[PDB]
Design a protein around this ligand. Structure first.
Ligand SMILES: Nc1ncnc2c1ncn2[C@@H]1O[C@H](COP(=O)(O)OP(=O)(O)O)[C@@H](O)[C@H]1O
Length: 313
């Protein structure tokens, strides 16, 4: 039947009720841009920050970073940690893999000395400790390394059953979800591929798919490798956005390198072939020089960063 005006009316009302009883973010249009809160934890790559839509990681909720080994999950999470602290925030790290390397964490900008770390005996304990730290309203971010490592007690006592982690995670997340929103702490769950992921998948508000694309070099061996993140689930902004960035060996995420890609992909930075220029002056010849350039001249590096945030949000 013929209709159009009164139609978009009924739809506008529909969406309203939806969000009125299931939360603002229940339904969305990939095209929308709406929402932009006060607090956000920058990830260390503006490319990933815009892919998130709100300029960083959500607050007061659960986030899931999954992907194979050596993809970039830990790096990305450690940067989120460094930032949280730099804004006068306190971070906790529930380790069940015993793989954390403080030196690297330091080169990323993590205040290790202040870093609350814990290594529980069982899965319950981990989550139980995590919940407790959260309810203190003192934690800003708490990152749990490996969902696949949180083995339940029973299995660890030889008194082994079916899907104990599943039941384990589910009960946990039920309680942790609320306690997080009431506090404002964002919890990061690292998930190594190849678990009790079933629940995490639904409880999570943001889900990032992290994979390594190609191990970049510079005519030399290899200063790192290019990483791609896909936000497969984002209850705070239109989903299915992706982002790529370089992670240098022993260095972490290259902010500058990201400022240059977003730099061209937005007009602010020009490329007269091999040559990267900005507002009349030349940054360098070849991305690596431009990178080395921006890392030296902090001043200009921040000028370019601002112009993108104002250009988008
Ligand atoms: N101690 C370290 N020294 C140097 N590079 C590291 C170190 N830890 C991590 N990395 C870098 O991070 C990449 C991915 O590993 P990591 O950050 O631990 O994430 P994940 O293993 O969860 O994908 C590595 O290939 C490497 O480039």
């Amino acid at each position: 039947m013929t209709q159009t005006p009164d139609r978009e009316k009924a739809l506008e009302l529909a969406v309203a009720q939806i969000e009125k009883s299931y939360g603002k973010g229940s339904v969305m249009r990939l095209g929308d841009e709406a929402r932009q809160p006060i607090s956000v934890i920058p990830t260390g790559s503006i490319a990933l920050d815009v892919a998130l839509g709100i300029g960083g990681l959500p607050r007061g909720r659960v986030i899931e970073i999954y992907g194979p080994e050596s993809s970039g999950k830990t790096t990305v999470a450690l940067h989120a940690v460094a930032n949280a602290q730099a804004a006068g925030g306190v971070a906790a790290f529930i380790d069940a893999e015993h793989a954390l390397d403080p030196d690297y964490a330091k080169k990323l900008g993590v205040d290790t000395d202040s870093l609350l770390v814990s290594q529980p005996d069982t899965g319950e304990q981990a989550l139980e400790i995590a919940d407790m730290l959260i309810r203190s309203g003192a934690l800003d971010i708490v990152v749990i390394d490996s969902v696949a490592a949180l083995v339940p007690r029973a299995e660890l006592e030889g008194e082994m059953h079916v899907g104990l982690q599943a039941r384990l995670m589910s009960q946990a997340l039920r309680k942790m979800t609320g306690a997080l929103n009431n506090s404002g702490t964002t919890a990061i769950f690292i998930n190594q591929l190849r678990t009790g992921g079933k629940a995490l998948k639904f409880y999570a508000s943001v889900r990032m798919d992290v994979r390594r694309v190609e191990t970049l070099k510079d005519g030399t061996n290899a200063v790192g490798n290019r990483t791609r993140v896909k936000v497969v689930k984002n209850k705070c902004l239109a989903p299915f956005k992706q982002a790529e960035f370089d992670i240098l060996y022993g260095k972490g995420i290259s902010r500058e390198g990201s400022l240059i890609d977003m730099g061209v992909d937005q007009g602010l930075i020009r490329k007269s072939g091999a040559w990267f220029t900005y507002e009349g002056e030349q940054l360098g010849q070849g991305k690596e020089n431009a990178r080395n350039f921006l890392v030296e001249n902090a001043d200009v590096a921040d000028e370019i960063e601002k112009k993108i945030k104002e250009k988008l949000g």
